[PDB]
Amino acid sequence: SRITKFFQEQPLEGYTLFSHRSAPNGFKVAIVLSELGFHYNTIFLDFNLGEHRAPEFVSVNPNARVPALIDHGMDNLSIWESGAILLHLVNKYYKETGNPLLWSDDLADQSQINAWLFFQTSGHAPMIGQALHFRYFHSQKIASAVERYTDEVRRVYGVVEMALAERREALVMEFDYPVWLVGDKLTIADLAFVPWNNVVDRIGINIKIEFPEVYKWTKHMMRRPAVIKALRGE
């Protein structure tokens, strides 16, 4: 059944990405796969058709959510949770080339990158998701719930904004030059937010004017080829 069929005709090389057209978390992985130069195909599951129920899938991700990545080169190794997939990809790239692209070979920087990465996947993403749920998909309207989560999303961007502003000032103590969260270079730490930054408007957040720094940062990332490519569907 499309899914069962795929699992009977998998490739020996590359990666297969399970995602959704409205899954920022899914595009997050596509972005990273793109940036790292990994060849992949994407399967956009249809939950309404019950594809996530497909036992073959629940084997790839016991959670039955997207994204999930099968690393075909490593004996169809399976990885679920966008953050685990991210750490796996950069680790693999670094060990195959000696170049920590979007990562770092130094433990200290890695822990900072992980700090941000966990913060985005467990503090930014979930809060944005709850704001969308109550403002649009809940069985009834609860304004206090929508405000709670909407405020937290703002609070979180406050944190990022402040970190980007400081990284900026430091460079001044040597105006539109790219500034980043860790090691003054682009990392998965930065990339992990791009996808979500593009949907926060839907809960009333206007990055352009609410968070000057965040805006310039998300704009620098959004102009990246790999980022536009991934976002288009390549």
Ligand X SMILES: CCCCCCSC[C@H](NC(=O)CC[C@H]([NH3+])C(=O)O)C(=O)NCC(=O)O
Ligand Y SMILES: N[C@@H](CCC(=O)N[C@@H](CS)C(=O)NCC(=O)O)C(=O)O
Would you tell me which residues interact with ligand X (CB under 6 A)?
Answer: 20, 22-25, 47, 65-67, 81-83, 121-123, 129, 132, 199
Give the one residue of 17, 67, 90, 188 binding ligand Y; rule: CB under 6 A. Answer: 67
Are 28 and 191 in contact by the 8 Å Cβ rule? The answer is yes
CA distance 38 to 173: 38
Binding string, 142-171, against a copy of itself, x = CB under 8 A? x-xx--x-------x--x--xx--------
- The C-alpha atoms of residue 123 and residue 48 are separated, in whole angstroms, by 28
Kindly tell me which residue out of 81, 147, 152, 210 binds ligand Y, with binding defined by CB under 6 A: 81
Helices (H), 49-142: 55-60, 82-97, 107-119, 125-132
According to the annotation, is 66 in a ligand binding site?
yes
**Quick count: other Cβ atoms within 10 Å of Cβ 144?**
8
Does residue 17 bind a copy of itself (CB under 8 A)? no
User: On the CB side of 41, how many CA atoms lie within 13 Å of its CA?
Assistant: 10
Tokens for 174, please give them.
Answer: 């040597």
Collapse the DSSP code of 215 into the 3-class scheme (helix H, G, I; strand E, B; otherwise coil) and give the result.
helix
Give which of 54, 99, 92, 95 is closest to 73, Cα–Cα: 92
Per-residue x/- mask for a copy of itself, residues 56 to 75, rule CB under 8 A?
------xxx---------x-
Specify binding-site residues for glutathione. 25, 52, 65-66, 81-82
Which parts of this chain interact with ligand Y (CB under 6 A)?
A: 20, 23, 25, 47, 52, 65-67, 80-83, 121-123
Which parts of this chain interact with a copy of itself (CB under 8 A)?
A: 62-64, 74, 77, 79-85, 87-88, 91-92, 95, 107-108, 110-112, 114-119, 121-123, 125-126, 130, 134, 138-140, 142, 144-145, 148, 156, 159, 162-163
